[PDB]
Every structure is written in C-alpha cells, then in structure tokens.
Amino acid sequence: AISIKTPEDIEKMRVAGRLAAEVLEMIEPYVKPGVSTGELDRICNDYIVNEQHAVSACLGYHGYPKSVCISINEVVCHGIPDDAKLLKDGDIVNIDVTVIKDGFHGDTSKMFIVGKPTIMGERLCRITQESLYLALRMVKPGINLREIGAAIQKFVEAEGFSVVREYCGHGIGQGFHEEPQVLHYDSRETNVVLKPGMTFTIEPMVNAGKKEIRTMKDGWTVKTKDRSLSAQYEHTIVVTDNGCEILTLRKDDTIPAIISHD
Numbered sequence: 001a002i003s004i005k006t007p008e009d010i011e012k013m014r015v016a017g018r019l020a021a022e023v024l025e026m027i028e029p030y031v032k033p034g035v036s037t038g039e040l041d042r043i044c045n046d047y048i049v050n051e052q053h054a055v056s057a058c059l060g061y062h063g064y065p066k067s068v069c070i071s072i073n074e075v076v077c078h079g080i081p082d083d084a085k086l087l088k089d090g091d092i093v094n095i096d097v098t099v100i101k102d103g104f105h106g107d108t109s110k111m112f113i114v115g116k117p118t119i120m121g122e123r124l125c126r127i128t129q130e131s132l133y134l135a136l137r138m139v140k141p142g143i144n145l146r147e148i149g150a151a152i153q154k155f156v157e158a159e160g161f162s163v164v165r166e167y168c169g170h171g172i173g174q175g176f177h178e179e180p181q182v183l184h185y186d187s188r189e190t191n192v193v194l195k196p197g198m199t200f201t202i203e204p205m206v207n208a209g210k211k212e213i214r215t216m217k218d219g220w221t222v223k224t225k226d227r228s229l230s231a232q233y234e235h236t237i238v239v240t241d242n243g244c245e246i247l248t249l250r251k252d253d254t255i256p257a258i259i260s261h262d
C-alpha cells in the first residue's frame with residue numbers, strides 16, 4: 001500500500017531530491033548541437049558516481065542498460081542514450097534522472113531546447129511545464145488525486161495538445177516506483193485521498209499531436225504514434241500539513257519550493 005514517510009525519511013528524500021536536481025543543473029552547458037546522447041549519459045553517470053558519491057537508480061533496473069533516460073522529439077519517454085544519436089538545432093530533449101542516496105530515491109526531469117528553438121517546440125515545452133506547475137499548486141491533504149489528473153487534462157486539451165494515458169507519476173521512497181499510480185488525466189478509476197507524509201512524482205507527458213503511443217522493439221523507447229513532438233517534466237514532492245514541498249526544485253524553476261494553502 002501507500003507508505004507514509006517519517007520525518008527522518010523525508011530528510012533523506014530532500015538530499016536525494018537535491019542531488020537529482022543538481023545533475024540537471026550541471027548538464028545544461030553540455031546540451032548543444034553535435035553532442036551525442038551517449039556522451040550526455042556518460043557525463044551524468046560520472047558526476048553521480050564520482051562527485052556525488054551516489055548511484056543511478058536506472059542502471060540495471062529491469063535490465064536497463066544506461067544511467068539516465070534521454071528522449072528526443074517524438075520519443076515520449078525512456079529513450080536510451082546512444083553514441084550514435086546526435087543532437088541537432090531545434091531538437092527538444094528530455095533528460096530524466098533518478099538518483100539513490102542513503103537508500104532513498106529522487107526522480108526528476110526537464111526539457112532542454114537545442115540550439116535555435118522552433119515555435120512548436122518552445123510552445124510545447126512551456127505548456128507542459130505549466131501543466132505540472134498547475135498540478136503542484138493543487139496538492140494538499142484531503143484532496144483526491146483524481147482532481148489533479150482532471151485539471152492537467154483540461155488545461156492541456158484546452159491548449160490544443162493531448163495527454164499520454166499509459167505512463168504516469170508514482171509513489172517513490174525506498175522504492176523507485178511505489179503506490180500510488182498518479183494519472184495525468186481524468187479517470188473514474190482514480191480514488192486516492194492525499195495525506196501528509198505521502199511522497200510521489202507528477203510527470204505529465206504531452207503530445208503536440210494525438211495521444212496514441214507505440215513501444216519500440218528495444219522494449220523501452222516509447223514514441224508517439226503520429227510522430228508528433230512530445231514533452232515531459234517531472235518533480236518529486238512530499239505532501240505537507242498545508243500543501244506540498246518540492247524536493248527536486250532547481251535554480252530555473254519559477255515556482256516556490258514550499259506551497260502553502262490557507
């Protein structure tokens with residue numbers, strides 16, 4: 001079931017969360033035209049292991065072969081880094097990192113725009129981030145997860161985009177993917193009331209085109225069925241007495257770390 005974190009658990013999650021955010025801050029300058037995703041993966045891994053003295057939660061997970069997930073353009077999620085995949089001007093790329101420190105996980109991701117942005121790419125990234133922020137603002141004890149998924153969907157669809165149904169946010173802590181499943185759309189199947197001490201991620205995947213997706217032969221890579229662009233952002237949070245605290249906040253986030261209701 002849903003694990004409630006103790007204060008000591010939470011302290012450890014703050015550290016892991018900050019470490020993960022830091023990998024994202026760190027990598028920025030390397031994201032340029034001509035770099036391969038395989039190289040980005042190596043830089044991230046070295047940092048995690050050698051500087052942070054932490055470990056990547058992805059390496060070996062269900063056999064995943066790399067340290068982070070890098071998803072370019074039409075890839076929705078779980079893109080596998082490769083020395084042969086080079087970034088080009090206009091690409092939009094998601095880098096999703098999950099670090100383990102002292103047994104606790106920190107999971108977060110953001111989009112990067114390579115070189116000169118395209119109109120669609122910039123728009124898509126912006127809207128996706130805003131959808132995540134909207135959701136964060138709603139988190140508080142007593143509310144049903146359903147309301148959050150419904151809000152994300154309505155926002156996104158109003159902007160002419162679609163939300164991916166298949167992949168979702170999830171509880172996180174000592175475990176990588178714990179209960180509950182955090183859907184990014186309205187579903188009558190969702191019935192979970194939030195309570196303080198719950199820790200989970202919100203990580204909406206939004207497509208420029210239609211919602212349909214397709215899993216590749218590698219068994220990890222997911223792409224949009226219509227080849228439209230897809231974007232995603234993710235944060236790990238903790239439900240507090242009157243709101244929430246964002247554990248993976250970065251310098252570039254424009255939302256406050258602690259959100260309070262009253």
Ligand SMILES: CSCC[C@H](N)[PH](=O)O
Pocket residue numbers: 058061064069078096097098107108177203234
């Ligand atoms: C190769 S497993 C990677 C899982 C992602 N961090 P998701 O946001 O749980």
Ligand SMILES: [Co+2]
Pocket residue numbers: 096097098107108109234
């Ligand atoms: Co992630």
Ligand SMILES: [Co+2]
Pocket residue numbers: 107169170201203234
């Ligand atoms: Co996640």
Ligand code: NA
Pocket residue numbers: 071072073074075076092093094229230231232
């Ligand atoms: Na993408």
